[PDB]
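Field: COMPLEX_INPUT
Field: COMPONENT_COUNT = five
Field: RESIDUE_TOTAL = 758
Field: MODE = joint
Values follow.
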Amino acid sequence: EDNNRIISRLWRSFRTVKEMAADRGYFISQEEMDQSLEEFRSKICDSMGNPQRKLMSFLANPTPEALEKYSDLGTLWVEFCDEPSVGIKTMRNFCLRIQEKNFSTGIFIYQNNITPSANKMIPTVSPAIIETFQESDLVVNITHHELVPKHIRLSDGEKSQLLQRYKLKESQLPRIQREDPVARYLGLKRGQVVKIIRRSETSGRYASYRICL
Amino acid sequence: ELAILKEERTTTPYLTKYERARILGTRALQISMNAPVLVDIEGETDPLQIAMKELSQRKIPLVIRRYLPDGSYEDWGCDELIVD
Amino acid sequence: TPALTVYLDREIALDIEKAKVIQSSIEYTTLKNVTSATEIYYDPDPTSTVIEEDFDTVEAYFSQSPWLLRLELDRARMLDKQLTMNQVADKISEVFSDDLFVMWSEDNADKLIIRCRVIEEDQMLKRIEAHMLDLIALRGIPGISKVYMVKHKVSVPDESGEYKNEELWALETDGINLAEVMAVPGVDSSRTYSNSFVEILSVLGIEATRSSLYKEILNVIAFDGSYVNYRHMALLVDVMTSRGYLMAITRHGINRADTGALMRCSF
Amino acid sequence: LGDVELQKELNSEYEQLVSDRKFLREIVFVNGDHNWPLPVNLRRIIQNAQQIFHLDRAKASDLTIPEIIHGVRDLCKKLFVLRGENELIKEAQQNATSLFQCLVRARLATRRILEEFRLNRDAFEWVLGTIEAQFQRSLVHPGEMV
Amino acid sequence: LIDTAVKTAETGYIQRRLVKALEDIMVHYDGTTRNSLGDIIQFLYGED
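Field: COMPLEX_OUTPUT
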């Protein structure tokens, strides 16, 4: 019954996170990406059917290709938080865990909300980066939508080559806000450029570039 | 400094409608102020007509300075640009 | 006129019975929507009732405050919406629980009745009754007041490769909500569309907004048979999206640019 | 007949046409609309070539097959929108004319050139030159207050 | 008669705001479409 919809939405959120990790260049095994829903229920739920988020956390490393392209790509830690309301108590142990195991990036999925007081504890934990997501927002992977063309982040060498070809200052490119859904999905930081190849009814194919604020 | 060398010029080799109109008018103006004309003048004595005759024979002695967005520029002579 | 265009998965879209199931799960139904009348009695004996109408109902069923809250459900709207007395009471339990006792009559009864009691309060029951009608959600997605069953003629290639028409069922809804409707099982989550591009920007990002903006402008121009070449409408929507957010064509958008003061003051 | 070496070109031609049809039907024009605003009209250019060179009759053409396949393929590299040798420009130049190249190849296909339009050597070289000249003339002019 | 007389000023205002929004947008010699600040609006005019 209603317990099945909790598990289902959570299972769908998990597949989306894996897709997210794959697109950022990290290596995810071809057995974990295709993991069915049935195997998922067996491993994650109790005898009463209630799910244990701490068993879902995982670690991933960049593929050799991604490491060749982006030399700034470290280890990624994904964590589902068991506490619906994330308070000052939860964030301290999370920031400690990241530093102690020296994770480069941490993705923090919460359940219901994140208090504005706790929201200031995020940029104080640099040069490590923390990205938060509401569990609702990940039930559907928005990049599979018809209207969202494929975004590919440009490398630093490709970016420099681009600016010279058009003789332009960085501040002259079209922009995308940091809180935009597709920028957050890729974990874009300020100064990075996405390339966007989208369908065109007059030329067939057209490459658009945007830089992230 | 800003000037782009002849071998590395990248803008279009055809005369645009805007470049054509400016060249014809400027050259016409100079002829009406008694600049030396570089073609034979037969029966057609209007200032605009003489300038149009010079254009058709690739004999207008002017250079287009095409500004690019960054401020750099390519100089193109009207003798070398292809006119449709 | 906010509106969603909700395409359905293929297996569901060619079976009208399954599509109706999707319809009833999306549509917002409050308790107020199905309630015909509410009443407030003085019923001092908790094990009995002065009401002769609910005599046989409560006496056989049983085998705190003296004020009784008695609300009546309309049989027609309850039957059409496919709601049972049980599931209506279930939703009430989670939000009320121990504080309010719930007793329902059977569907075979002449009137469908639900009794409630609390376990100065003359006005508190009026305030609670106001609180009940204004907040109890029985099912569905908030903001979706009505769902329409719409047939789409979509051109899809044959197995032979020839283009043929193909009729498919989709849904259209009043109100605005995109994120929650996308997640609903049955809905084709990769194709759902909304005519409010402000909401699209929050859910799908700026590049999807560029396509949605174009679709909505083109639909306006093309409607009275006119046709404007693509590059002109394309040019307008790139200006409206270049900053990464939607810059309105009003003073609040246009004059927030880094353009010169003489240019900006002329508008 | 029998020439396997000439069949390698014609196979590569048809394979190219299969790529285009698959790309256009599944990515570009999902609903199947096949009439679209495009530049450099080809139907009118061909029927003018039929008039200048009197391309009627039942006479056999002296226009060889490798001239057709190599002629059309070399044309699609001279449709210059942007000039310069930079790697990014060539990708952009190829992207800008993707839809139009498909249009040309869909018309100047081997069977149609020979059976339907019936071009000879003089007319076909003229058709290539005209397409090349008129496409340049159809580019927007810098300075245009669009 | 009322509609024609009323809604003519509605659309007249629409055209005025559109022109001021777009008046400075020009095609440059590299094919890009830019405004007076040199911001790129399209990398290639009309995508073709």
